[PDB]
Design a binder for this molecule. Structure first.
Ligand SMILES: [Zn+2]
Length: 313
């Protein structure tokens, strides 16, 4: 573990809302005078058991309620940044889901103020470079996403890219092609969740329609040889999340994971924690699961960690 923990890493697939530890959630509910549906921290944690992406999302979104003030968003992001410091993550390019908060009445400026403030601290105090990524909720309409992009324009320089998460299946990348086209037109790079629960077809759409710089997850590309060859050949990064895939049942076991297989084939795969508060581990716990269950070597360790550095935007 320690050896894995000491590797220089970049995290490129990480939802700030997904770093919301049960402990923090309760203390934020206390500071905001919110009565939680959960009786204690331990009952919330016990509820972190999922049969699929949606069961997790439902609870993930429920957790966002306690996020209401700028100081809430600062606390959230600063707590995660300290995790990065402990685990020697020297560079972060994290998602947030503005709609989850703006739709609850929290002003866009307030969400950003807290995150941005923390990121400044992370860089000047912790030495951690950052590239904030604004993610659209794919289960909502392109229209709502357009409205979100309008809110972000005055702020555009705070974001290096736009992303695309939430319920994948039945909401293909094509659904958001116009808004992505506009974000690019307005100077945004692009990334997207694809081939987590979704078909390889969604990965192609992400590549050619949304014109992404990297694929988030992308594990189901292993079903598509001609896409495999494309990945391998173009060296497009994949932000693979081991514990996430296991906990959401993408793989029945960590020993079933194809990330090393992909690495050995030349796919520029990386390791990320995704929603570490929900999946029982941050980036280092992800590297470790790989070693324990797939006998990953220090060799592939250094290699994966180096890819995350290479894949920075
Ligand atoms: Zn994700």
């Amino acid at each position: 573990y320690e050896w894995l923990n000491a590797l220089p890493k970049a995290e490129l697939h990480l939802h700030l809302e997904g770093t919301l530890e049960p402990e923090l959630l309760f203390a934020l509910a206390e500071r905001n005078r919110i009565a939680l549906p959960w009786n204690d921290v331990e009952t919330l944690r016990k509820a972190y058991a999922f049969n699929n992406l949606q069961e997790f999302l439902d609870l993930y979104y429920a957790g966002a309620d306690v996020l209401r003030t700028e100081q809430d968003f600062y606390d959230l992001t600063w707590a995660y940044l300290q995790k990065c410091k402990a685990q020697n993550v020297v560079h972060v390019e994290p998602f947030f889901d503005p709609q989850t908060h703006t739709d609850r009445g929290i002003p866009f400026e307030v969400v950003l103020a807290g995150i941005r403030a923390a990121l400044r601290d992370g860089e000047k105090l912790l030495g951690i470079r950052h590239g904030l990524i604004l993610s659209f909720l794919r289960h909502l309409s392109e229209e709502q996403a357009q409205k979100t992009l309008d809110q972000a324009l005055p702020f555009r320089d705070a974001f290096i890219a736009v992303g695309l998460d939430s319920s994948e299946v039945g909401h293909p990348p094509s659904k958001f092609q116009r808004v992505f086209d506009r974000a690019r037109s307005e100077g945004f790079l692009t990334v997207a969740h694809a081939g987590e629960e979704g078909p390889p077809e969604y990965i192609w759409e992400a590549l050619d329609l949304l014109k992404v710089e990297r694929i988030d997850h992308g594990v189901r590309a292993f079903e598509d040889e001609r896409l495999m060859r494309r990945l391998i050949d173009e060296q497009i990064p994949l932000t693979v999340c081991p514990l996430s895939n296991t906990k959401l049942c993408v793989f029945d076991d960590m020993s079933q994971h194809t990330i090393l297989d992909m690495l050995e084939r030349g796919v520029k795969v990386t390791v990320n924690s995704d929603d570490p508060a929900y999946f029982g581990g941050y980036v280092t716990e992800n590297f470790h699961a790989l070693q324990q269950s797939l006998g990953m070597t220090e060799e592939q360790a250094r290699r994966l960690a180096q890819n995350s550095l290479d894949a920075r935007l």
